Ligand binder design. Sequence first.
Ligand code: CU
Ligand code: CU
Ligand code: CU
Lengths: 7, 5, 7, 7, 138, 138, 138, 138
Amino acid sequence: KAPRKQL
Amino acid sequence: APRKQ
Amino acid sequence: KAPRKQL
Amino acid sequence: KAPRKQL
Amino acid sequence: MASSCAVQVKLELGHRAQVRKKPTVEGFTHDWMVFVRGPEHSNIQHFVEKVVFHLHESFPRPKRVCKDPPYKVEESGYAGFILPIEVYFKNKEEPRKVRFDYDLFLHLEGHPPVNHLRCEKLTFNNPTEDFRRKLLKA
Amino acid sequence: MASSCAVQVKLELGHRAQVRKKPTVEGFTHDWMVFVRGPEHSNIQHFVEKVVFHLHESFPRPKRVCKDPPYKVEESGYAGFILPIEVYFKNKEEPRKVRFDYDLFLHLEGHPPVNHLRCEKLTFNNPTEDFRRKLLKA
Amino acid sequence: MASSCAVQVKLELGHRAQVRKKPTVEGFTHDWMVFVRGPEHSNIQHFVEKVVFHLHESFPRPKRVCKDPPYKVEESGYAGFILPIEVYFKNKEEPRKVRFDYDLFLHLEGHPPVNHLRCEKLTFNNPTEDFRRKLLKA
Amino acid sequence: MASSCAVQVKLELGHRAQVRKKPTVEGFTHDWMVFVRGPEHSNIQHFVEKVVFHLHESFPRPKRVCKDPPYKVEESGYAGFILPIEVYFKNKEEPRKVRFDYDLFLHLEGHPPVNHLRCEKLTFNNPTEDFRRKLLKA
Ligand SMILES: [Cu+2]
Ligand SMILES: [Cu+2]
Ligand SMILES: [Cu+2]
């Protein structure tokens, strides 16, 4: 997407 | 020394 | 208007 | 280590 | 952004406090005068709209407003107190005013008179160029 | 006065240094590229007149001049060196330029390529009004 | 007091993030490295005791601790995240640490690799002169 | 770099100018006192070696030197003048001295007495370990 991690 | 305060 | 010497 | 331009 | 203008001006708040020769009709022991001024020579008139002195409730018209220099109030009293002072700028954005809580303190009888000076720095972050022009004319 | 504008702009100095697959015939081993730009995609072109890269004497036309973005130099070489960079402003008053001694260093053939970044903050004290809006457009 | 020292040190936070030519056996698309360093020719080891990188939960040993320079972490992954970095100081007084929320972002395949630099200014007010010398040794 | 200590001390420059009636043998209408001290009664004796008041040429020994506290000059005169004050510090390094152009003004009879105060801030960039130990004790 850039993709990001879950928080 | 006097203060009203 | 006052006594100020001067340089 | 690494090459340089001499001055 | 990211770029930034930071305009700094200097202000001076202070007060005198003498004992009279003899107390008033109401038996006021002291004479005092508090002020807000620029440093020599300046002229804060360019960016300052009005200064508001908040005297104690025991004063008639305790809210004294000076919108032209000199920014001062002359009075007689018996005691000292905390005096909130508000400086309003010729500004259309925040901050439109700054508040100082000035300690207008008195000294006792048989003691030297009062002459206190308190210097304050003001920092405006990215002001408009019109207000900046005012701040820089000071 | 006492009043002052302190405008701060940000600059990025950096360079890439890759080892060629096959050396050039002239014999050069590396390919590098050195640049000057604003961080986070700032258009420094607003206040930057031109950027001048001073290469080593070994290079033909060692004085490279970019007066339009991107402000960068691409070459091929065999060694690293100190590369004086000069950034000229749309100033009219001192300082008209700023100089950095940039270390254009190279890595060895068995080591990973160079991707170096260097940050520089510029501070202009009491600039003119026209130069200010240029600085703040970045 | 009235007197005060403000000791200023420069810190640099940055990260490189490259797409792998072929993903790892676990399916990781990216190669990245994150670091904390000082500017140019300055050793921050003089006043830095340790640097702690707090990786995302997915990473094993998410709490990585660097005791000596270089203060870096190199890993492989599939996504970016917020990486809390704590820089511990060699003083016995407050503050012994500073915290930054570093944005360790990646770029997609078919985009240029990531090379990001972020500079941070640290201001220590009235430190002990023992701790102060280390700050100045950098 | 950095490597940056900025040490700040505050000074208070002021003067009283009391009118005297009747005038003296020599025709001195007034008698005044000018001084240099630290705010909130801080012992500037620690970082100040001596203060030198430069009176007008009319005075005998125009160059007046206070090497011990208080740093004051009491005298009688007929006129006001710009009074150069030089503050010498207990440093072995530049700057060895600071100079202010103090305005010693007087009011006529029928106008309130003089009790003037002036703020001056001094910033020393990167002092030695010695001297700094004095400035903060001041
Ligand atoms: Cu990006
Ligand atoms: Cu006092
Ligand atoms: Cu006055």
